[PDB]
Structure formats: C-alpha cells, structure tokens
Amino acid sequence: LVIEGTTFKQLITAKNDKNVKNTILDLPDDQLMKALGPYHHPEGLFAPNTYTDKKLTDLYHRQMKALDAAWAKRAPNLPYKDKYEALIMASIVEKETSLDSELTQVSGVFVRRLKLGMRLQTDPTVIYGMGANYKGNITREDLRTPTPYNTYTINGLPPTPIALPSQKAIEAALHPDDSNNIYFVATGNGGHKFTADLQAHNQAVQEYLSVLRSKK
Amino acid sequence: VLEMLSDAQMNRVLVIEGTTFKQLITALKNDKNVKNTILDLPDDQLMKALGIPYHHPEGLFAPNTYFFAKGETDKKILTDLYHRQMKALDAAWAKRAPNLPYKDKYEALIMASIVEKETSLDSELTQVSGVFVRRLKLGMRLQTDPTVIYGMGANYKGNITREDLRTPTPYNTYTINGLPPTPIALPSQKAIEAALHPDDSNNIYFVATGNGGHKFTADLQAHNQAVQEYLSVLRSK
Amino acid sequence: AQMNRVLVIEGTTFKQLITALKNDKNVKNTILDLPDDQLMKALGIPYHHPEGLFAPNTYFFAKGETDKKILTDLYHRQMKALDAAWAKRAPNLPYKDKYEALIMASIVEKETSLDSELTQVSGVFVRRLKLGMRLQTDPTVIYGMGANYKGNITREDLRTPTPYNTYTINGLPPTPIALPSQKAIEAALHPDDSNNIYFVATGNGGHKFTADLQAHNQAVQEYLSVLRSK
Amino acid sequence: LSDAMNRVLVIEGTTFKQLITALKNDKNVKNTILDLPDDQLMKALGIPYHHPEGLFAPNTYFFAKGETDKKILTDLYHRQMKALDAAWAKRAPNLPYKDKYEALIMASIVEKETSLDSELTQVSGVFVRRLKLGMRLQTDPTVIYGMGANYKGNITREDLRTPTPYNTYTINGLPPTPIALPSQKAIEAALHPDDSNNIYFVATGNGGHKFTADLQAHNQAVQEYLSVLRSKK
Amino acid sequence: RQVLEMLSDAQMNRVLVIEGTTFKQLITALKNDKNVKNTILDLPDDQLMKALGIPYHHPEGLFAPNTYFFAKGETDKKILTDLYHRQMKALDAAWAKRAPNLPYKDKYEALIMASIVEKETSLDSELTQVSGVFVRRLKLGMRLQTDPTVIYGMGANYKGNITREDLRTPTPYNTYTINGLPPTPIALPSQKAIEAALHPDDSNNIYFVATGNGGHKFTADLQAHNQAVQEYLSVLRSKKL
Amino acid sequence: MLSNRVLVIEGTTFKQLITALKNDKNVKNTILDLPDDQLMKALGIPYHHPEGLFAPNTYFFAKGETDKKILTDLYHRQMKALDAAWAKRAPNLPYKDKYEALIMASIVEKETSLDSELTQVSGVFVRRLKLGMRLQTDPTVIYGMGANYKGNITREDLRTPTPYNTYTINGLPPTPIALPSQKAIEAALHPDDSNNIYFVATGNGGHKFTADLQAHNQAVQEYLSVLRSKKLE
C-alpha cells in the first residue's frame, strides 16, 4: 500500500483509484491540512504499512500513536526539542538505509552530529528540497545552493520531514547507538561502513569504489 | 534469487529463534528425512564429530527456515547451520561497535542468546543489550531469569521458585559474576547485531510492561517503582 | 569436421588460457604444466614470463593438436600484431621497447570497456609516465594479489609493495597483466592529445577524464550521486 | 541497429543528397517534401541550419513500412545531434573549433579521408594540428564537394587550382559546411585528436596511410603509392 | 676452488636457516638481526607472500634451509625472495626428475610431504624410508598419523605434550583425523627431504617408530609395529631414570 | 518455476545439447565424449538411441555441477512428461507405445513454430499413419542425412532411402529426430478433429491444411510464389 520511505505526494496520487474519489485531494496542502483536522506541511504524518476518502485519517492516527509511544519511552539527552524534530530525524534516517540492523547506527551518526554542532550533510534532504528539479544525479552546484532543507549549508534539522517514516525508523531516531561514528558510506556489498574520523571514511569510500568496479 | 533469501522438492528444516540446541536435536531425531548418524552423541564427542572447536554446542546453529535434501545426513545439516551461524557472527564482529566488554566473539554469542531470550520486540533489542552490556562494564551481575532456567536444566518443570533463583548453578546470573559459560539458546542474526551494537543510554534496569515491551531505567529507585507497578498489574489478570 | 574451438577473449590471463587448454580433450598436454621459464624456453619465446604474449581471438584447431603448436601460433599472431603496431607507432612515446607497449596495452585493456575511450585511457597513463607519476591503476594491484583477490581491495592491499602494485612501484609493472586486444595495443601506441591524468566512471557507461585532482574529486562525487539514485 | 519493416541503411561518408535520392526511390517511404528546395526543407523539418549536410546520422535503420519521410529524417537528425552534443560535452581541451558545427565539419572531412577506424584519431590529428599552424588542409573530398554538379568522377589539376568555397587548397581553414554525413566514431575522433607531430599523410593502397612530420619522407611515400596505383591498373 | 665456495650465497652477514624450522622462526630471527633491514617483516603473512611475489597463500615450507651469506645491511625482501627462489628451484628440479606413480597432485603436495618427512627423521639414511611409509600409506588410504602435524595444527595450544585428547581433536593439520596431506607444509624442508618425498624406498613397510638409540625401526604389519613400540617404550623408560 | 542458465531449446538435437554442455565452463565433463551407446549406458537410460529423451526448458543450474546429474534430471523430467501425457492420451491413436508418441512429437516439433497449429500438424500425421500414407517430412530427411547436410536439400536427397527418410519408408522413423517440448508431446497425443492430410507453409507465418491433393497443390503454388517474392536481395 504505502511503503516506508515513500513521499507524501506518492501516496496522494495513488487519487488514481476507483475506491477513493478526489474530494480534498487537489486542494492546496496548507488548506488541506486545515481541512483534514494541525501541522502546516503534510510530509511524514502518515504511517507506512501494509494495510472512503477519510479512511488518510486512520493512517495519521496510526502514525501519531506510533510517534507518541516512541516519544514516551525515548532515550535521555536527545537533541530533540519536541516529537516533531524526532519525526524529522526519523524520516532522515529512513531513506538513508534499507537495512533495519543499521537503523540505530545511522541514527547515532546524525544524533551525535547534532550534539557536536556538525551539519548532517545527508543527500536526501537536498534531493527533497529540489524536488521536481532532481535529475537522478547530484552536482556540487546543487549542494552549494542554500535550500531550506539543504543540510550541507544549514545547521541542525530541516523544517519538516522528507518522507514517510516507519515505526522502526521513529524508534531508532529515539534510540541512537553507543558509538563515536559520525560518518558512513555504502559498502557496495550491501550495507554501510560507519567511521569516526574523515580519513577512515575516505578509505571506506575508496573501498566502495573498488568493490563497485569489481561488481561491474 | 529471492528464495535463496529464505534459505526441486526437499525436506524443510526449521530452527526457531530463541530455541535451544537440544530442541533442534530432538526435532531432527523426530524427522524421517534426516538420517540418524550422530544425533545421540555426547556433546564432546559430537563437537569432535562435526569439527567444531568449541567444547559445548549451544548457540552455534543459526535459526532460519532451510531446505535440505530428503535423506540428508544429520552431520551435513548441523555443519551447514554451524557455518551459517559463524558467518553471521564473524560478519557482526567485524563491524562491531568500539569499547565492547567481550573478550572474543564467543562472549558476544553468549550475550546474543541472553538478549534473544529476554526480549520480544525488535525495537528493544539494542536497549536490552545495552542494559546487559553496561552491567558487564559496571560489574553488575546480569540477573536474568532465562539463564537460571538453563542452569536448572533437567530440574525445570516449566516454573521457577525463589529457591531456584537462590540456587547456585554455573549459569545462574543471580549468583555468578559476568556472563554464563555458554550460550543458553540459539540467537538470531538480529540478536547478534544487537549484542554488538548497544544503545546510547544510562539504563541498567528494565522490567516488562506486560504487552511485550519493557520499562528501562538507570536508577534502582525508579526500577523498583516500575517493578512494583508491573507486579500489581500482572497479579490481577 | 566440427574441429575443436579454442576461444581466447580479451582481458583474460595466460593462466586462464593454460587451464582452458588443460581442460580440453582435443588438446594434447605436452608442456602445459611446466614452470613459466622452462615453458617459454620450450616454445622458443625469448621472454621469461608468458603474460600478454598470446593474441585473444577465436581459433579452430584439429582435434589432438599439440599444446606447443597452439601456443606457438598464438604467440606468432600476437607478435605479428605488436610488431605491426610498433612499426607505425607515434613519436615520443615513453616505451623502451615493444614489450613495454604490450604491458601498457594490457593495463589499458583491463581499465576500459568502451573502444571510444581507449586512446584517452592510454593518454592518461602515457602522460603519467612522462610526468613521473605512478599509474595507480587497480587491475595491476589485483594481478599482484592474485589468488588472494576476492572481488574487493582494502587499504592494506593498496599499501602492500607487491611487484605489480602501481600505487607503490614507479612506472610499468614487470610484465603485462592480461592478454590485450589489437585495438588496445594500437591505443597504447597512439595516446590522445590532452592534459587529462585522471578518470572515473560516470555511471552512464563511460568515464569522466580530468587533468587536476579537484576536478577529479568533483567527478567522483557526481558518480557517487548517480549510483545512489539507481 | 536502430529500429522503430523497411530497412533504410545510411552508410557513413554519403552525402545528404544521396540519402534524399535513395528515399525518393523507395516505394515503402511516403514522399511528401523530398523535392522541395533545401532551405524550405530545413524550415519544414524544423532544423535551424541553413545547409543540411552532415546533420543526419549514418546507421542501419528499420522503420515501419509506409513511414513518412519527415519522421525518418527528423529521427536521423535528432540522432546525429544526440551524438554531437554528447561528444562535444566530453571533448578534449585546446581544440581549434569555435563551436560544435566546426567539429562536425571536421568529422565529415576525417570520415571522407579514411576507411580504417584505427587511423581516425591520427587523421584528425593531422588536420587539427594544421588548423593550429595555419596550414591549409589540402584534402581532395572538399574540392570535389566544392565543384559539386561539375564533378563527373574525375579531378584535374585545374580543378584543384580553381577557388571554390569548399576548396581547402585555396581556402585557409575549414570549409563553410560539412561535405558528408559523419559517423559517431568520426565525430569522436574529430573531438579527440592524437598526440603526434605528424602533419602529412598519404594512402598505402591497402586501405591505410603513412603519417609523417616532414615533407621528404612524405614524398618518398607519395611516389611509392603512385607507383603501386599505376602498376596495379 | 670455488666449488666449495658455495656453502650458500646471495665482512658479510651469515644468515643460517636450519632444517625443520618453521617460517615464523625465520621471520623472528630476521627481525632480531642487526644487519638485516626491516622493511616488510611485520606484514600479515598473506600480504607478505604477495609483497615478495609469491603466488602461494601460506608461507610455510617455501624457504630453503641452508647457511647463507648476505651483504651486511641487506634488505629482508632480497633475502626472502632469494630463499624462495632457491626453494622453488630445488622443488622444480626434484619434481621434474620425480619417481613414477607417486600420489601427488602437484609439487606443492610434494613440498608438504617433504616437510612432514623432515620433521619425522634426523638421519638422512632413513629419509627415503620415512617418505616411503607415508607415500605407501596414501595409496592405501591410511592416515599418516604423524605427531608434528598435530602439533602444527594446535599452534599456540601446545605445551610439550600430545595426549589422546589432543590427538582426537579435529585440526586442519591433524593427520589422525584427516585423510591425506595437511593443507600446507608444517616446516621448511631441506633439499634432501624434497628429493626423498619424490623418491620413496622400495619396500612394503607402512609403519615405523623410534628405536630409542637413535633412528627408527620400520615394519610392514601392525604386530611387528607393536612389538617395536614395546621395545621403544622399554628403552626410553629405562632412560627416564 | 523455471526448472548459470542451462537452456535447451525445443527442436534442438541431442548432439547440439552435448556440444553445448561440452562448450560450458560451468559444467564439468565426465562422459560427454563417450559414444552414445556407452553414454546411455553410463546414465542408466534403457533406450539404445539418445535422441528425443531430454526436455527443453530454462534451468538455471548450479555452476560446476556434474553433467550426469543435469542429463539424468532432464531425462527424468521428459519421461515424466511423456508418461503423464500417455496416461491421458486420446483414443484410437496409431501409436504402439509411448516411444512412437515421442518420435511423432519430435517430428511435430520440427514441423511447426506456432503453438496454435501443433494439434493440426499432429492430426495430419496421425491420419496419414492410419491411411498408410508416408509422412513426407523434410526434418526426417535432414536427420537421416546427418553429417552430410550442407543446409540444402536436393531431389536425389529426398529420393535416397535412409532409415529415417519419410518419403521412402512407411510409418514412423526408428527414433526421434529432435528433443520435443511437452506441448508437442501432448499435441502428438491429442490430434485435431479434421479430415486434413496435407499441409504446407504459407511463408507469412503458419501453414495451410487441406484434405485433398488438388487443394494442397494450389496451396503449394501460392507458397512458392510468395516465398520467391520475399527473397530478392
């Protein structure tokens, strides 16, 4: 139905079914958030799972229930002011990995960065900020252009989520791993290599280059 | 392939997460399709028969739904499950987090079995491991009931008593310091990964809520608040 | 007839070819298991090590033919191609003799899959040699690791001074590292006119070539993004 | 192979006019605008160039029987500009082309000067260097093209002596337009010349050429080729 | 004149590698030599074999025992590469001239057997005999049952004792539990041991045991072997007091 | 559930399959160069000739696997198919045993490319057998000539008596002539309800089936005209 990591817009169009008619679906999103019954932007507020126009409503409740549960049992000394920032981070974490085993590790990388004052420098934020201007490839001019969601230029979390996060992604966002790693790069054989200093990261990226050549 | 992912027409062997080696032994002894070559070995003689350099076999065979040729020898299957489990354990050890209190990967497997038997929700795996990991670093005894059951062994009739908790076995983490001598169950790859990637927290206590989860805490007064609360809730049902 | 076919594909090793003839019923094994020095002496080839000296192509031979005839003919075809290309070669090339050209042809072969880019790759390496820079080409490191190569290279691998490691050695490796094609040899002898000394895959089938490390690093980042989307 | 059956094969080195005549004499292709003057044809096809030469890619094309000419040619033009844009984007530095059109012109010259792929880069080099040194390209296909209709399959000494806009013995630099339809390999070669000092070359008679940087070696080679070509026939 | 000049060669450094030694002993002895420059001695063994150009994965048995002479200040890589070349020269010479119907797949198996034979005897006169016993055993499917192999397999786990429990534990090198040759050599064999591995003696003997007075007794049936073992037990037991 | 991709195509010969196994790095060779009698002895197959006994399909076998497992499994798969089809066969068929059905299946397989027509071809041959007519099928003549087949057939080839020549012998050939698919086996055992005893290729895909010689000859004339028209250059 709605798979973790998908866009809100992705769910909005999938408006193209017999069972759901276009009642409030083509309304502007701000006025639509007013109409649906409390966030200004709709991204991240609907729970991905394998489950009338109103049903979105059930998913929202299912999503907020999940977040509330996760926020209630959350870990101490987290750099989140409120549950919304945790949801933003959960979205960031979700699209940065496909393996559950690494969720906490990814979360750690970003959580620690926030506490250390570092920019998150995660590509999905910029891809999201450009949206329809994304041509399947990222260049230096893309990363240097200040967007509201550009985590290479801004400090801290972006204003909103960038995708629909899962319950596992929320819990991971609220339970980072105990490590010093603040970098990670795909291994090329499935997964990521996490590191704590830039030189180790560049070694890992070079390893990723070699495996990717070998995979050719 | 996507069915190689779920490890012709053949026999379907299943190893369930949290299960003991011995249960697997009985399940193969109760399968026609596997030939009984070595199922009644003493554990020392069986570890020698399979080539496994460990003295005791617990925890060394990976839970998963596998397919084996109808008629396969038992040793074939046991060796392959051993190789798969050690593949997972070596992989997890290679990418482990720093400053872990494990002398070697065997201790990681031990704790992975403990964590596996102590938790029901994957979301809490890292947390449970953390509580135990921190305890090991802080010198606290693990005080986990599944270890006590394992230590009682044949003397376990599906229920434990206060005398059971006070009775010194080699596996009783209320009486011994540190990890027990061997694993106490067959851990999943997720439990091994959790054992090697504890969460960033101060909690060193936890107790079940009753709906599959637990309340985690960092101080004994808060732990005791939560436990008396759970005792009250669980008694009523 | 349906006479025996021995297929030699470009980029394969001599060892692969030796095993391929040793696993053929139709080919007689007279000298196939000899050490390389004695084997080259047995065939009359004046080189000490056999890599790169046998031309890749699809050959047909009579069932029961000798290994020595087959290898002599492959050596003669490769040397025909090499002498021809060397005779018409470009000026000012940094090769002492045709053997060094063959080494470079093997490197180029294993470093590229599109014909259109062969000369450019050759240029990159030719220039590096004229500039005194190390070639820093991974296929040589793979060859140096040999049987210990499992499809991945580690930092300890790149630092290991093997005889073929172009990150640690200066110049060309001691021998070729594969069986090069004719076009790869021609490219070795006709580098392109450019200042580029770096290249990295684009992700869309080709490579991006550059002359400075900053541009190369931008290109590598672009490749990382492209591979991420797919 | 390029598919959309009718097999329109356009071989590299052919002229645009040849392609137009080969399509007007094809039963399977509908003839709508092939007999219009070329300026009107370029306006009708949407192409922004004044002259059509070199802008339609040689290849083995398979269309639907009964296809319109405009589709066939628009597809060929778009394919050529795809190749040309890609090649210009990845081109070598310090090239003497002001824009991609000059590169395509040069690709046509190179294509008409060689039959072996092995030599394309070398041919391009010889000419590219010449452009940089101010030397005239002195390539005969250009003069043939400049004579145009007055070319009956034979060239005379005064033909080479007569100044046409396409005569590279009399003009300095490149001719005003391409002289043939260049292949993808020829465009790439034009944009990636070889590193050599050679500025002369002459055919061997077996399909290849001898390249050199000095006139005397060139002259030895030219006489040898002259002898072989006379003695053969 | 210069015939005896060649004790071995490469005022002068005098490296000496003894028969029966392990690779590891040689590397440590090169690290504790002032005159040998340590450029690559501290590498892992796989990467070290690759650094030297050696195509074998494991370094054991590939460096020839002899008393050599190198320039004072010589690099380790020169030393090890030349010792490797000398060992492979000996091995190729012996493999090319080897006896027929031998149970070796390749020269590496011969080198493994040479290492075993080297560790199993100290008298050159008996080399051929020992190799014979092991060679014949391979043809008959019998396990070599040689203690130096199990010692090598136990590695650090060896305190000077071989017990029935030690002999019963499966190692990759345990010739009581595996059939055929171990995965790698277990020591550095000498030229004589390589040749002996490739030139077994003509007999039916498939058993042997130390005599106790220097040498071994070889036998063709187990009863003779057990009588000989009893004789060796008595001889050494008396030497205990 | 498509049974390293080892693919055996319908209508291919056994000899082709052996060569494709012998031309594989991924499959190790133990008995591929044995004579066919001795190799059938090796695999345990009780038939004297190996043709027709191995099922075409896309397999994706495990690399570095013995040929004997692969071929015994293919033999068993096709013999399972054949027994299944024989058990459910149509009544009054002129086959003495399942081997004749397999032979006919091979003939049918090599005689048609459209699945829709299998039964029809099958019918034509079955009826012919009941009426004593010769099958007069060219793939049988090709197989009978064997190594002597140069891609072309002469009238003397069709007139030369081979053991497999269905222009000269009555009934089925001694063995199959290719490896038939299961669809072909079933069609061989389920002929169509018709009186047609002739068929000829159309040249535009398919065949024209008829019940009388004059209609068949008309169809043959049309096919000859069409096929001559298609091949010009």
Side-chain angles (χ1 to χ4, degrees), chain D residues 45-58:
Chain D
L45 281 173
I47 301 170
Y49 292 90
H50 300 311
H51 211 55
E53 191 66 76
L55 303 164
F56 306 81

PDB file of all heavy atoms in Angstrom, chain D residues 45-58:
ATOM      1  N   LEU D  45      11.377  20.726 -41.782  1.00  0.00           N
ATOM      2  CA  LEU D  45      11.828  19.704 -40.847  1.00  0.00           C
ATOM      3  C   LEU D  45      12.105  20.265 -39.458  1.00  0.00           C
ATOM      4  O   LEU D  45      12.303  19.483 -38.520  1.00  0.00           O
ATOM      5  CB  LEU D  45      13.100  19.027 -41.377  1.00  0.00           C
ATOM      6  CG  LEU D  45      12.951  17.949 -42.458  1.00  0.00           C
ATOM      7  CD1 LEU D  45      14.323  17.506 -42.979  1.00  0.00           C
ATOM      8  CD2 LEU D  45      12.165  16.743 -41.930  1.00  0.00           C
ATOM      9  N   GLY D  46      12.118  21.591 -39.308  1.00  0.00           N
ATOM     10  CA  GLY D  46      12.393  22.216 -38.040  1.00  0.00           C
ATOM     11  C   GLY D  46      13.856  22.404 -37.725  1.00  0.00           C
ATOM     12  O   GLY D  46      14.180  22.862 -36.623  1.00  0.00           O
ATOM     13  N   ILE D  47      14.746  22.075 -38.650  1.00  0.00           N
ATOM     14  CA  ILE D  47      16.182  22.157 -38.383  1.00  0.00           C
ATOM     15  C   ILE D  47      16.622  23.612 -38.516  1.00  0.00           C
ATOM     16  O   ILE D  47      16.225  24.283 -39.481  1.00  0.00           O
ATOM     17  CB  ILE D  47      16.952  21.251 -39.339  1.00  0.00           C
ATOM     18  CG1 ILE D  47      16.471  19.804 -39.174  1.00  0.00           C
ATOM     19  CG2 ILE D  47      18.443  21.350 -39.074  1.00  0.00           C
ATOM     20  CD1 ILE D  47      16.970  18.839 -40.230  1.00  0.00           C
ATOM     21  N   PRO D  48      17.412  24.133 -37.575  1.00  0.00           N
ATOM     22  CA  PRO D  48      17.790  25.554 -37.615  1.00  0.00           C
ATOM     23  C   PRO D  48      18.988  25.868 -38.497  1.00  0.00           C
ATOM     24  O   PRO D  48      19.421  27.028 -38.530  1.00  0.00           O
ATOM     25  CB  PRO D  48      18.118  25.860 -36.145  1.00  0.00           C
ATOM     26  CG  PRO D  48      18.642  24.548 -35.612  1.00  0.00           C
ATOM     27  CD  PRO D  48      17.867  23.467 -36.338  1.00  0.00           C
ATOM     28  N   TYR D  49      19.533  24.891 -39.208  1.00  0.00           N
ATOM     29  CA  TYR D  49      20.707  25.109 -40.039  1.00  0.00           C
ATOM     30  C   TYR D  49      20.325  25.469 -41.468  1.00  0.00           C
ATOM     31  O   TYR D  49      19.279  25.054 -41.978  1.00  0.00           O
ATOM     32  CB  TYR D  49      21.595  23.861 -40.034  1.00  0.00           C
ATOM     33  CG  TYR D  49      22.239  23.596 -38.697  1.00  0.00           C
ATOM     34  CD1 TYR D  49      21.616  22.801 -37.740  1.00  0.00           C
ATOM     35  CD2 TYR D  49      23.467  24.154 -38.386  1.00  0.00           C
ATOM     36  CE1 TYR D  49      22.211  22.567 -36.509  1.00  0.00           C
ATOM     37  CE2 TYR D  49      24.067  23.929 -37.162  1.00  0.00           C
ATOM     38  CZ  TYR D  49      23.435  23.141 -36.227  1.00  0.00           C
ATOM     39  OH  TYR D  49      24.043  22.924 -35.012  1.00  0.00           O
ATOM     40  N   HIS D  50      21.184  26.279 -42.100  1.00  0.00           N
ATOM     41  CA  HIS D  50      20.912  26.736 -43.459  1.00  0.00           C
ATOM     42  C   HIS D  50      21.140  25.622 -44.474  1.00  0.00           C
ATOM     43  O   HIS D  50      20.377  25.488 -45.437  1.00  0.00           O
ATOM     44  CB  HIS D  50      21.795  27.937 -43.801  1.00  0.00           C
ATOM     45  CG  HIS D  50      21.589  29.119 -42.906  1.00  0.00           C
ATOM     46  ND1 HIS D  50      20.339  29.619 -42.610  1.00  0.00           N
ATOM     47  CD2 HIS D  50      22.475  29.908 -42.253  1.00  0.00           C
ATOM     48  CE1 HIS D  50      20.464  30.660 -41.805  1.00  0.00           C
ATOM     49  NE2 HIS D  50      21.749  30.857 -41.574  1.00  0.00           N
ATOM     50  N   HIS D  51      22.205  24.806 -44.275  1.00  0.00           N
ATOM     51  CA  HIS D  51      22.624  23.721 -45.151  1.00  0.00           C
ATOM     52  C   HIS D  51      22.442  22.383 -44.446  1.00  0.00           C
ATOM     53  O   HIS D  51      22.791  22.256 -43.266  1.00  0.00           O
ATOM     54  CB  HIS D  51      24.101  23.904 -45.534  1.00  0.00           C
ATOM     55  CG  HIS D  51      24.465  23.391 -46.895  1.00  0.00           C
ATOM     56  ND1 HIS D  51      23.811  23.782 -48.046  1.00  0.00           N
ATOM     57  CD2 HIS D  51      25.448  22.547 -47.293  1.00  0.00           C
ATOM     58  CE1 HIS D  51      24.363  23.187 -49.089  1.00  0.00           C
ATOM     59  NE2 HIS D  51      25.361  22.435 -48.661  1.00  0.00           N
ATOM     60  N   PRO D  52      21.931  21.361 -45.132  1.00  0.00           N
ATOM     61  CA  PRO D  52      21.579  20.113 -44.445  1.00  0.00           C
ATOM     62  C   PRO D  52      22.721  19.123 -44.278  1.00  0.00           C
ATOM     63  O   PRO D  52      22.523  18.095 -43.623  1.00  0.00           O
ATOM     64  CB  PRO D  52      20.498  19.525 -45.371  1.00  0.00           C
ATOM     65  CG  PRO D  52      20.911  19.958 -46.729  1.00  0.00           C
ATOM     66  CD  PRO D  52      21.524  21.339 -46.552  1.00  0.00           C
ATOM     67  N   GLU D  53      23.906  19.400 -44.809  1.00  0.00           N
ATOM     68  CA  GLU D  53      24.937  18.374 -44.878  1.00  0.00           C
ATOM     69  C   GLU D  53      25.491  18.047 -43.499  1.00  0.00           C
ATOM     70  O   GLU D  53      25.737  18.937 -42.679  1.00  0.00           O
ATOM     71  CB  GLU D  53      26.073  18.822 -45.806  1.00  0.00           C
ATOM     72  CG  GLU D  53      27.060  17.715 -46.132  1.00  0.00           C
ATOM     73  CD  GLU D  53      26.429  16.606 -46.952  1.00  0.00           C
ATOM     74  OE1 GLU D  53      26.231  16.816 -48.157  1.00  0.00           O
ATOM     75  OE2 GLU D  53      26.088  15.539 -46.382  1.00  0.00           O
ATOM     76  N   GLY D  54      25.683  16.751 -43.260  1.00  0.00           N
ATOM     77  CA  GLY D  54      26.317  16.234 -42.065  1.00  0.00           C
ATOM     78  C   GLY D  54      25.418  16.077 -40.861  1.00  0.00           C
ATOM     79  O   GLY D  54      25.880  15.564 -39.836  1.00  0.00           O
ATOM     80  N   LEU D  55      24.146  16.453 -40.960  1.00  0.00           N
ATOM     81  CA  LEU D  55      23.264  16.565 -39.806  1.00  0.00           C
ATOM     82  C   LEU D  55      22.321  15.384 -39.624  1.00  0.00           C
ATOM     83  O   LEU D  55      21.390  15.480 -38.830  1.00  0.00           O
ATOM     84  CB  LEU D  55      22.452  17.855 -39.915  1.00  0.00           C
ATOM     85  CG  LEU D  55      23.349  19.089 -40.032  1.00  0.00           C
ATOM     86  CD1 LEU D  55      22.563  20.302 -40.523  1.00  0.00           C
ATOM     87  CD2 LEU D  55      24.020  19.394 -38.695  1.00  0.00           C
ATOM     88  N   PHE D  56      22.533  14.284 -40.330  1.00  0.00           N
ATOM     89  CA  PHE D  56      21.664  13.117 -40.272  1.00  0.00           C
ATOM     90  C   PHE D  56      22.559  11.902 -40.142  1.00  0.00           C
ATOM     91  O   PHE D  56      23.466  11.711 -40.953  1.00  0.00           O
ATOM     92  CB  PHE D  56      20.786  13.074 -41.516  1.00  0.00           C
ATOM     93  CG  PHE D  56      20.021  14.339 -41.741  1.00  0.00           C
ATOM     94  CD1 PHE D  56      20.637  15.416 -42.337  1.00  0.00           C
ATOM     95  CD2 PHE D  56      18.666  14.417 -41.476  1.00  0.00           C
ATOM     96  CE1 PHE D  56      19.957  16.603 -42.551  1.00  0.00           C
ATOM     97  CE2 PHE D  56      17.970  15.593 -41.727  1.00  0.00           C
ATOM     98  CZ  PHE D  56      18.621  16.686 -42.259  1.00  0.00           C
ATOM     99  N   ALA D  57      22.323  11.112 -39.122  1.00  0.00           N
ATOM    100  CA  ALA D  57      23.338  10.166 -38.679  1.00  0.00           C
ATOM    101  C   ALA D  57      23.326   8.915 -39.550  1.00  0.00           C
ATOM    102  O   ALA D  57      22.275   8.301 -39.726  1.00  0.00           O
ATOM    103  CB  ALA D  57      23.114   9.790 -37.219  1.00  0.00           C
ATOM    104  N   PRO D  58      24.478   8.499 -40.077  1.00  0.00           N
ATOM    105  CA  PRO D  58      24.525   7.233 -40.823  1.00  0.00           C
ATOM    106  C   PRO D  58      24.360   6.079 -39.854  1.00  0.00           C
ATOM    107  O   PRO D  58      24.961   6.070 -38.780  1.00  0.00           O
ATOM    108  CB  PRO D  58      25.918   7.247 -41.459  1.00  0.00           C
ATOM    109  CG  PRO D  58      26.734   8.086 -40.524  1.00  0.00           C
ATOM    110  CD  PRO D  58      25.801   9.141 -39.989  1.00  0.00           C
TER     111      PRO D  58
END
